[PDB]
Design a protein around this nucleic acid. Structure first.
Ligand code: DTP
Ligand code: CA
Ligand code: MN
Length: 430
DNA sequence: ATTATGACGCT
DNA sequence: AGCGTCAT
Protein backbone atom coordinates (compact mmCIF):
# COMPACT_ATOMS: atom_id res chain seq x y z
CA UNK A 1 0.00 0.00 0.00
CA UNK A 2 1.59 3.24 1.36
CA UNK A 3 5.11 1.74 1.43
CA UNK A 4 4.78 0.42 -2.14
CA UNK A 5 7.29 2.22 -4.35
CA UNK A 6 5.70 3.09 -7.68
CA UNK A 7 8.73 4.24 -9.68
CA UNK A 8 7.32 7.73 -10.21
CA UNK A 9 10.21 9.69 -8.69
CA UNK A 10 11.78 10.81 -11.98
CA UNK A 11 10.85 12.39 -15.30
CA UNK A 12 12.89 10.82 -18.11
CA UNK A 13 12.69 11.36 -21.85
CA UNK A 14 14.21 9.54 -24.80
CA UNK A 15 14.72 11.61 -27.93
CA UNK A 16 15.33 9.69 -31.14
CA UNK A 17 15.94 11.22 -34.57
CA UNK A 18 13.57 10.21 -37.38
CA UNK A 19 15.27 8.11 -40.11
CA UNK A 20 18.45 9.88 -39.08
CA UNK A 21 21.05 9.23 -41.82
CA UNK A 22 18.34 9.89 -44.43
CA UNK A 23 17.55 13.26 -42.87
CA UNK A 24 21.25 14.19 -42.82
CA UNK A 25 21.43 13.42 -46.55
CA UNK A 26 18.11 15.22 -47.26
CA UNK A 27 19.31 18.37 -45.52
CA UNK A 28 22.40 18.33 -47.74
CA UNK A 29 20.58 17.50 -50.95
CA UNK A 30 17.14 19.12 -51.23
CA UNK A 31 16.30 16.91 -54.23
CA UNK A 32 15.93 14.02 -51.75
CA UNK A 33 13.43 15.79 -49.50
CA UNK A 34 9.90 14.37 -49.20
CA UNK A 35 10.85 11.43 -51.37
CA UNK A 36 11.13 7.68 -50.95
CA UNK A 37 14.81 7.40 -50.27
CA UNK A 38 17.38 5.37 -48.42
CA UNK A 39 21.01 5.54 -47.40
CA UNK A 40 23.22 2.75 -48.68
CA UNK A 41 26.78 1.58 -48.06
CA UNK A 42 28.90 0.21 -50.87
CA UNK A 43 27.28 -0.37 -54.27
CA UNK A 44 28.99 -3.18 -56.14
CA UNK A 45 27.34 -6.09 -54.30
CA UNK A 46 23.60 -6.02 -55.05
CA UNK A 47 23.43 -2.22 -55.24
CA UNK A 48 24.71 -1.74 -51.71
CA UNK A 49 23.23 -2.46 -48.30
CA UNK A 50 20.51 -0.18 -46.97
CA UNK A 51 21.10 1.23 -43.50
CA UNK A 52 18.39 3.95 -43.30
CA UNK A 53 14.98 4.41 -44.93
CA UNK A 54 12.67 7.43 -45.31
CA UNK A 55 9.07 6.98 -44.16
CA UNK A 56 7.87 7.46 -47.73
CA UNK A 57 10.06 4.51 -48.75
CA UNK A 58 8.94 2.35 -45.80
CA UNK A 59 5.41 2.53 -47.22
CA UNK A 60 6.70 0.45 -50.15
CA UNK A 61 8.19 -2.14 -47.79
CA UNK A 62 11.79 -0.94 -48.00
CA UNK A 63 13.73 -1.84 -44.84
CA UNK A 64 17.14 -1.72 -43.24
CA UNK A 65 19.45 -4.65 -44.21
CA UNK A 66 17.82 -4.92 -47.63
CA UNK A 67 20.07 -4.85 -50.70
CA UNK A 68 19.33 -1.75 -52.77
CA UNK A 69 18.74 -3.91 -55.86
CA UNK A 70 15.98 -5.72 -53.96
CA UNK A 71 14.58 -2.50 -52.54
CA UNK A 72 14.30 -1.16 -56.10
CA UNK A 73 12.04 -4.11 -56.87
CA UNK A 74 9.57 -2.87 -54.25
CA UNK A 75 10.09 0.81 -55.02
CA UNK A 76 11.45 1.52 -58.52
CA UNK A 77 11.68 5.27 -57.93
CA UNK A 78 13.59 4.89 -54.64
CA UNK A 79 16.29 7.53 -54.34
CA UNK A 80 19.64 6.60 -52.79
CA UNK A 81 22.41 8.44 -51.03
CA UNK A 82 25.74 6.67 -50.47
CA UNK A 83 27.85 6.62 -47.35
CA UNK A 84 31.20 8.27 -47.98
CA UNK A 85 34.11 5.97 -48.67
CA UNK A 86 37.60 6.84 -47.46
CA UNK A 87 40.70 4.65 -47.35
CA UNK A 88 38.71 1.83 -48.88
CA UNK A 89 35.95 1.74 -46.26
CA UNK A 90 32.62 3.27 -45.33
CA UNK A 91 33.22 6.42 -43.32
CA UNK A 92 30.48 7.61 -40.95
CA UNK A 93 31.95 11.01 -40.04
CA UNK A 94 29.14 13.11 -41.56
CA UNK A 95 26.60 11.35 -39.34
CA UNK A 96 28.74 11.51 -36.21
CA UNK A 97 29.12 15.25 -36.71
CA UNK A 98 25.37 15.68 -37.27
CA UNK A 99 24.83 13.72 -34.05
CA UNK A 100 27.01 16.18 -32.16
CA UNK A 101 24.84 19.05 -33.49
CA UNK A 102 21.79 17.47 -31.92
CA UNK A 103 23.43 16.37 -28.67
CA UNK A 104 24.78 19.87 -27.98
CA UNK A 105 21.29 21.41 -28.38
CA UNK A 106 19.72 18.83 -26.06
CA UNK A 107 22.45 19.43 -23.48
CA UNK A 108 21.23 23.04 -23.11
CA UNK A 109 18.03 21.75 -21.53
CA UNK A 110 19.33 19.01 -19.26
CA UNK A 111 21.97 16.39 -18.57
CA UNK A 112 21.86 13.77 -21.32
CA UNK A 113 23.03 10.19 -21.81
CA UNK A 114 24.17 9.49 -25.38
CA UNK A 115 22.53 6.13 -26.10
CA UNK A 116 23.36 5.84 -29.79
CA UNK A 117 24.41 7.96 -32.73
CA UNK A 118 20.87 9.32 -32.99
CA UNK A 119 19.32 9.20 -29.52
CA UNK A 120 19.80 10.36 -25.99
CA UNK A 121 18.05 10.07 -22.67
CA UNK A 122 17.15 13.21 -20.79
CA UNK A 123 16.73 13.50 -17.03
CA UNK A 124 14.08 16.21 -16.73
CA UNK A 125 13.20 15.86 -13.05
CA UNK A 126 14.89 19.12 -11.97
CA UNK A 127 13.82 21.13 -15.05
CA UNK A 128 10.23 20.05 -14.38
CA UNK A 129 10.43 21.18 -10.75
CA UNK A 130 11.68 24.54 -11.99
CA UNK A 131 8.98 24.99 -14.63
CA UNK A 132 6.28 24.02 -12.11
CA UNK A 133 7.29 26.93 -9.85
CA UNK A 134 7.05 29.38 -12.76
CA UNK A 135 3.68 28.01 -13.78
CA UNK A 136 2.42 29.04 -10.33
CA UNK A 137 -0.45 26.56 -10.39
CA UNK A 138 -1.69 27.71 -13.79
CA UNK A 139 -3.17 24.94 -16.01
CA UNK A 140 -1.37 23.51 -19.03
CA UNK A 141 -2.94 24.45 -22.34
CA UNK A 142 -3.20 21.87 -25.12
CA UNK A 143 -1.47 24.48 -27.30
CA UNK A 144 1.72 23.75 -25.36
CA UNK A 145 1.54 20.11 -26.47
CA UNK A 146 0.94 20.27 -30.24
CA UNK A 147 2.64 16.97 -31.15
CA UNK A 148 2.00 14.95 -27.97
CA UNK A 149 0.13 11.63 -27.70
CA UNK A 150 -1.11 10.41 -24.34
CA UNK A 151 -0.82 6.64 -24.47
CA UNK A 152 -4.09 4.84 -23.63
CA UNK A 153 -6.32 7.83 -24.43
CA UNK A 154 -8.92 8.63 -25.55
CA UNK A 155 -11.03 6.00 -23.81
CA UNK A 156 -14.79 5.55 -23.44
CA UNK A 157 -17.30 7.77 -25.30
CA UNK A 158 -12.88 10.19 -33.99
CA UNK A 159 -12.25 9.48 -37.68
CA UNK A 160 -8.99 11.43 -38.15
CA UNK A 161 -5.65 10.56 -36.54
CA UNK A 162 -4.95 14.14 -35.44
CA UNK A 163 -8.52 14.25 -34.14
CA UNK A 164 -7.83 11.18 -32.01
CA UNK A 165 -4.59 12.69 -30.74
CA UNK A 166 -6.38 15.83 -29.57
CA UNK A 167 -9.25 13.90 -28.03
CA UNK A 168 -6.82 11.91 -25.92
CA UNK A 169 -4.83 15.01 -24.98
CA UNK A 170 -7.95 16.86 -23.90
CA UNK A 171 -9.16 13.93 -21.75
CA UNK A 172 -5.74 13.87 -20.10
CA UNK A 173 -5.52 17.61 -19.49
CA UNK A 174 -9.11 17.81 -18.28
CA UNK A 175 -8.31 15.26 -15.61
CA UNK A 176 -5.03 16.83 -14.42
CA UNK A 177 -4.77 18.19 -10.88
CA UNK A 178 -2.34 21.11 -11.17
CA UNK A 179 -2.51 22.26 -7.52
CA UNK A 180 -0.29 19.33 -6.49
CA UNK A 181 3.32 20.15 -7.39
CA UNK A 182 4.28 16.53 -6.65
CA UNK A 183 1.65 14.67 -8.74
CA UNK A 184 3.63 12.35 -11.01
CA UNK A 185 1.12 12.81 -13.86
CA UNK A 186 1.51 16.58 -13.68
CA UNK A 187 5.30 16.19 -13.61
CA UNK A 188 5.19 14.02 -16.75
CA UNK A 189 2.99 16.59 -18.48
CA UNK A 190 5.39 19.42 -17.76
CA UNK A 191 8.15 17.07 -18.91
CA UNK A 192 6.29 16.74 -22.20
CA UNK A 193 6.02 20.54 -22.46
CA UNK A 194 9.80 20.80 -22.13
CA UNK A 195 10.37 18.06 -24.70
CA UNK A 196 8.14 19.91 -27.19
CA UNK A 197 10.46 22.89 -26.68
CA UNK A 198 13.58 20.70 -27.05
CA UNK A 199 12.26 19.09 -30.20
CA UNK A 200 11.32 22.49 -31.64
CA UNK A 201 14.84 23.76 -30.90
CA UNK A 202 16.42 20.75 -32.58
CA UNK A 203 14.33 21.22 -35.72
CA UNK A 204 14.82 25.01 -35.82
CA UNK A 205 18.60 24.80 -35.37
CA UNK A 206 19.43 21.71 -37.44
CA UNK A 207 16.56 21.01 -39.79
CA UNK A 208 16.14 17.52 -38.31
CA UNK A 209 12.87 16.12 -36.95
CA UNK A 210 12.69 13.59 -34.13
CA UNK A 211 10.32 11.65 -31.94
CA UNK A 212 10.40 11.33 -28.17
CA UNK A 213 9.03 9.33 -25.26
CA UNK A 214 8.30 10.82 -21.85
CA UNK A 215 7.87 8.59 -18.81
CA UNK A 216 9.31 7.84 -15.38
CA UNK A 217 12.30 5.78 -16.50
CA UNK A 218 14.49 4.95 -19.47
CA UNK A 219 12.80 1.71 -20.56
CA UNK A 220 9.32 3.25 -20.65
CA UNK A 221 10.64 6.39 -22.29
CA UNK A 222 12.26 4.33 -25.06
CA UNK A 223 9.11 2.26 -25.55
CA UNK A 224 6.98 5.41 -25.60
CA UNK A 225 9.17 7.09 -28.21
CA UNK A 226 8.38 4.40 -30.78
CA UNK A 227 4.59 4.37 -30.32
CA UNK A 228 3.99 7.43 -32.50
CA UNK A 229 6.74 8.04 -35.06
CA UNK A 230 7.73 10.09 -36.96
CA UNK A 231 7.78 13.66 -35.72
CA UNK A 232 5.62 13.06 -32.63
CA UNK A 233 6.13 12.45 -28.91
CA UNK A 234 4.32 10.12 -26.55
CA UNK A 235 3.67 10.32 -22.81
CA UNK A 236 3.42 6.93 -21.04
CA UNK A 237 2.07 7.46 -17.56
CA UNK A 238 2.45 5.03 -14.67
CA UNK A 239 -1.29 4.41 -14.90
CA UNK A 240 -1.10 3.44 -18.57
CA UNK A 241 1.26 0.54 -17.91
CA UNK A 242 -1.15 -2.34 -17.09
CA UNK A 243 -3.16 -1.93 -20.31
CA UNK A 244 -0.09 -1.14 -22.40
CA UNK A 245 1.76 -4.16 -21.11
CA UNK A 246 -1.23 -6.53 -21.29
CA UNK A 247 -0.70 -7.03 -25.04
CA UNK A 248 2.97 -6.00 -25.33
CA UNK A 249 5.22 -8.76 -26.68
CA UNK A 250 8.15 -9.28 -24.31
CA UNK A 251 10.70 -8.78 -27.11
CA UNK A 252 9.65 -5.13 -27.48
CA UNK A 253 11.16 -4.05 -24.18
CA UNK A 254 14.77 -2.89 -24.34
CA UNK A 255 17.20 -5.74 -23.41
CA UNK A 256 14.56 -8.45 -23.96
CA UNK A 257 14.82 -8.61 -27.76
CA UNK A 258 17.36 -11.43 -27.73
CA UNK A 259 18.08 -14.72 -25.98
CA UNK A 260 16.94 -13.64 -22.49
CA UNK A 261 13.59 -12.50 -23.83
CA UNK A 262 13.19 -15.77 -25.70
CA UNK A 263 13.99 -17.66 -22.50
CA UNK A 264 11.41 -15.68 -20.49
CA UNK A 265 8.82 -16.69 -23.09
CA UNK A 266 9.85 -20.36 -23.25
CA UNK A 267 10.45 -21.05 -19.59
CA UNK A 268 7.42 -19.22 -18.24
CA UNK A 269 5.11 -20.02 -21.16
CA UNK A 270 3.97 -16.41 -21.57
CA UNK A 271 3.87 -13.86 -24.45
CA UNK A 272 3.22 -10.39 -23.00
CA UNK A 273 5.09 -8.17 -20.58
CA UNK A 274 2.09 -7.87 -18.29
CA UNK A 275 1.94 -11.62 -17.72
CA UNK A 276 5.18 -11.32 -15.73
CA UNK A 277 3.31 -9.82 -12.75
CA UNK A 278 2.07 -13.29 -11.74
CA UNK A 279 5.52 -14.50 -10.68
CA UNK A 280 7.29 -13.76 -7.40
CA UNK A 281 10.58 -11.92 -7.41
CA UNK A 282 12.30 -15.11 -6.17
CA UNK A 283 10.66 -17.06 -8.98
CA UNK A 284 12.03 -14.72 -11.59
CA UNK A 285 15.44 -14.68 -9.93
CA UNK A 286 15.48 -18.47 -9.90
CA UNK A 287 15.16 -18.63 -13.69
CA UNK A 288 17.00 -15.52 -14.89
CA UNK A 289 19.50 -14.71 -12.14
CA UNK A 290 19.43 -12.27 -9.25
CA UNK A 291 19.88 -9.08 -11.28
CA UNK A 292 17.58 -9.94 -14.20
CA UNK A 293 14.91 -11.37 -11.88
CA UNK A 294 14.72 -8.23 -9.76
CA UNK A 295 14.78 -6.12 -12.90
CA UNK A 296 11.95 -8.11 -14.50
CA UNK A 297 9.84 -8.03 -11.33
CA UNK A 298 9.98 -4.23 -11.19
CA UNK A 299 9.92 -3.65 -14.95
CA UNK A 300 6.66 -5.51 -15.60
CA UNK A 301 5.08 -3.10 -13.06
CA UNK A 302 6.49 -0.10 -14.97
CA UNK A 303 9.34 0.40 -12.51
CA UNK A 304 13.03 0.77 -13.37
CA UNK A 305 15.84 2.58 -11.60
CA UNK A 306 18.68 2.76 -14.17
CA UNK A 307 19.98 6.32 -14.09
CA UNK A 308 20.43 8.63 -16.98
CA UNK A 309 24.19 8.71 -16.97
CA UNK A 310 25.86 12.04 -17.46
CA UNK A 311 27.70 11.14 -20.64
CA UNK A 312 27.45 12.98 -23.92
CA UNK A 313 30.55 11.62 -25.63
CA UNK A 314 31.20 8.04 -26.75
CA UNK A 315 33.45 6.01 -24.40
CA UNK A 316 35.32 4.37 -27.27
CA UNK A 317 36.39 5.27 -30.81
CA UNK A 318 36.55 2.36 -33.26
CA UNK A 319 37.11 1.40 -36.90
CA UNK A 320 35.97 -1.92 -38.40
CA UNK A 321 35.67 -3.62 -41.77
CA UNK A 322 34.23 -6.94 -42.89
CA UNK A 323 35.82 -8.90 -45.73
CA UNK A 324 33.04 -11.25 -46.77
CA UNK A 325 33.08 -14.35 -48.96
CA UNK A 326 35.99 -14.38 -51.35
CA UNK A 327 37.26 -10.93 -50.34
CA UNK A 328 38.61 -12.48 -47.12
CA UNK A 329 42.21 -11.44 -46.49
CA UNK A 330 44.59 -14.30 -47.29
CA UNK A 331 48.00 -12.66 -47.51
CA UNK A 332 50.14 -10.97 -44.87
CA UNK A 333 50.49 -7.87 -47.05
CA UNK A 334 46.71 -7.68 -47.35
CA UNK A 335 46.15 -7.89 -43.60
CA UNK A 336 48.82 -5.23 -43.05
CA UNK A 337 47.50 -2.81 -45.65
CA UNK A 338 43.99 -2.90 -44.21
CA UNK A 339 45.27 -2.57 -40.63
CA UNK A 340 46.93 0.60 -41.86
CA UNK A 341 43.74 1.89 -43.49
CA UNK A 342 41.81 1.33 -40.27
CA UNK A 343 44.63 2.86 -38.18
CA UNK A 344 44.73 5.94 -40.37
CA UNK A 345 41.02 6.62 -39.95
CA UNK A 346 41.39 5.92 -36.22
CA UNK A 347 44.29 8.36 -35.90
CA UNK A 348 42.29 11.05 -37.67
CA UNK A 349 39.29 10.58 -35.40
CA UNK A 350 41.47 10.29 -32.29
CA UNK A 351 43.41 13.46 -33.01
CA UNK A 352 40.18 15.41 -33.51
CA UNK A 353 38.75 13.89 -30.33
CA UNK A 354 41.77 15.01 -28.31
CA UNK A 355 41.48 18.61 -29.52
CA UNK A 356 37.71 18.75 -29.05
CA UNK A 357 37.29 16.89 -25.81
CA UNK A 358 40.51 17.19 -23.74
CA UNK A 359 41.15 13.49 -23.39
CA UNK A 360 43.47 10.77 -24.68
CA UNK A 361 42.85 7.08 -25.32
CA UNK A 362 45.32 4.75 -23.61
CA UNK A 363 44.40 1.28 -24.82
CA UNK A 364 44.16 -0.14 -28.33
CA UNK A 365 41.84 -3.13 -28.73
CA UNK A 366 42.32 -5.35 -31.79
CA UNK A 367 39.63 -7.76 -32.92
CA UNK A 368 39.55 -10.15 -35.85
CA UNK A 369 37.39 -12.78 -37.33
CA UNK A 370 38.27 -15.94 -39.14
CA UNK A 371 36.56 -17.62 -41.99
CA UNK A 372 34.29 -20.27 -40.72
CA UNK A 373 33.47 -18.57 -37.47
CA UNK A 374 30.27 -16.67 -37.52
CA UNK A 375 30.62 -15.23 -34.04
CA UNK A 376 31.09 -11.48 -34.53
CA UNK A 377 34.54 -11.65 -32.99
CA UNK A 378 36.86 -14.64 -33.15
CA UNK A 379 39.57 -13.02 -31.06
CA UNK A 380 40.29 -9.84 -29.11
CA UNK A 381 43.68 -8.64 -27.95
CA UNK A 382 44.70 -5.37 -26.30
CA UNK A 383 47.89 -3.37 -26.31
CA UNK A 384 49.06 0.01 -25.07
CA UNK A 385 48.07 3.05 -27.09
CA UNK A 386 50.91 5.44 -26.29
CA UNK A 387 51.01 7.59 -29.43
CA UNK A 388 48.41 8.80 -31.94
CA UNK A 389 50.32 7.37 -34.90
CA UNK A 390 48.67 5.18 -37.51
CA UNK A 391 51.81 3.31 -38.58
CA UNK A 392 52.64 2.46 -34.96
CA UNK A 393 49.07 1.45 -34.14
CA UNK A 394 48.84 -0.78 -37.22
CA UNK A 395 52.22 -2.35 -36.47
CA UNK A 396 51.16 -2.94 -32.86
CA UNK A 397 47.86 -4.46 -33.98
CA UNK A 398 49.67 -6.80 -36.33
CA UNK A 399 52.04 -7.83 -33.54
CA UNK A 400 49.20 -8.86 -31.20
CA UNK A 401 47.34 -10.83 -33.91
CA UNK A 402 50.11 -12.32 -36.07
CA UNK A 403 50.09 -15.49 -33.92
CA UNK A 404 46.68 -16.41 -35.16
CA UNK A 405 48.14 -17.23 -38.54
CA UNK A 406 48.25 -21.00 -38.89
CA UNK A 407 49.94 -20.77 -42.30
CA UNK A 408 53.39 -22.34 -42.24
CA UNK A 409 54.24 -19.85 -44.97
CA UNK A 410 55.56 -16.35 -44.25
CA UNK A 411 53.53 -14.52 -46.89
CA UNK A 412 50.24 -16.41 -46.64
CA UNK A 413 47.49 -15.92 -44.07
CA UNK A 414 45.29 -18.81 -42.99
CA UNK A 415 42.53 -19.11 -42.26
CA UNK A 416 41.60 -15.92 -44.15
CA UNK A 417 40.38 -12.96 -42.08
CA UNK A 418 36.76 -11.87 -42.58
CA UNK A 419 36.85 -8.93 -40.16
CA UNK A 420 39.34 -6.44 -38.70
CA UNK A 421 38.52 -4.04 -35.86
CA UNK A 422 40.59 -1.38 -34.12
CA UNK A 423 39.12 0.25 -31.03
CA UNK A 424 40.61 3.03 -28.91
CA UNK A 425 39.52 2.81 -25.28
CA UNK A 426 40.32 3.80 -21.68
CA UNK A 427 40.37 7.58 -21.98
CA UNK A 428 42.26 9.85 -19.58
CA UNK A 429 41.87 13.60 -19.21
CA UNK A 430 44.48 15.66 -21.05
C1' DA B 1 27.56 -11.02 -48.68
C1' DT B 2 22.50 -8.06 -42.57
C1' DT B 3 27.89 -3.53 -42.18
C1' DA B 4 29.81 -0.34 -38.88
C1' DT B 5 29.66 0.60 -34.96
C1' DG B 6 29.01 1.19 -29.35
C1' DA B 7 27.66 0.00 -24.21
C1' DC B 8 27.65 -3.18 -20.65
C1' DG B 9 27.58 -8.06 -18.32
C1' DC B 10 30.08 -12.45 -17.00
C1' DT B 11 33.84 -14.96 -15.24
C1' DA C 1 41.52 -9.65 -19.50
C1' DG C 2 38.88 -11.86 -23.11
C1' DC C 3 34.23 -13.38 -24.24
C1' DG C 4 29.30 -12.74 -24.96
C1' DT C 5 24.85 -10.19 -25.36
C1' DC C 6 22.02 -6.55 -27.03
C1' DA C 7 21.55 -2.56 -29.25
C1' DT C 8 21.24 1.15 -33.29
N1 DTP D 1 22.06 -2.14 -37.97
C1 DTP D 1 22.63 -0.90 -38.40
N2 DTP D 1 23.74 -0.88 -39.13
C2 DTP D 1 24.31 0.26 -39.56
N3 DTP D 1 23.74 1.46 -39.24
C3 DTP D 1 22.61 1.49 -38.51
C4 DTP D 1 22.02 0.29 -38.05
N4 DTP D 1 20.92 0.63 -37.35
C5 DTP D 1 20.83 1.96 -37.34
N5 DTP D 1 21.83 2.52 -38.05
C6 DTP D 1 22.07 3.91 -38.26
C7 DTP D 1 21.28 4.45 -39.40
C8 DTP D 1 20.15 5.11 -38.73
O1 DTP D 1 19.67 6.21 -39.53
C9 DTP D 1 20.66 5.55 -37.44
C10 DTP D 1 19.59 5.53 -36.35
O2 DTP D 1 19.03 4.25 -36.22
P1 DTP D 1 17.52 4.04 -35.82
O3 DTP D 1 17.13 5.04 -34.76
O4 DTP D 1 17.33 2.61 -35.36
O5 DTP D 1 16.64 4.18 -37.14
P2 DTP D 1 16.29 5.49 -37.96
O6 DTP D 1 16.68 6.79 -37.26
O7 DTP D 1 16.97 5.41 -39.30
O8 DTP D 1 14.71 5.43 -38.22
P3 DTP D 1 13.58 5.67 -37.11
O9 DTP D 1 12.75 6.86 -37.53
O10 DTP D 1 12.73 4.40 -37.13
O11 DTP D 1 14.24 5.85 -35.77
O12 DTP D 1 21.68 4.63 -37.07
CA1 CA E 1 15.98 7.06 -35.08
MN1 MN F 1 17.80 5.34 -32.54
Amino acid sequence: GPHMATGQDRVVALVDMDCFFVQVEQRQNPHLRNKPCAVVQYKSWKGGGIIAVSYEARAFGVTRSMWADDAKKLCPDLLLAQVRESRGKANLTKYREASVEVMEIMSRFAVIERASIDEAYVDLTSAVQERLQKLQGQPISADLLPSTYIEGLPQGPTVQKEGMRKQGLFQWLDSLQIDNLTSPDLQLTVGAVIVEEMRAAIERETGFQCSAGISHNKVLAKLACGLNKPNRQTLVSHGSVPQLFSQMPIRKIRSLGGKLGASVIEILGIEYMGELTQFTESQLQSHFGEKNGSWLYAMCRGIEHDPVKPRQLPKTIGCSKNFPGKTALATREQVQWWLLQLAQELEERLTKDRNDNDRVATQLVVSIRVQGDKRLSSLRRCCALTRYDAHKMSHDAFTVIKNCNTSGIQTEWSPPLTMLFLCATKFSAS
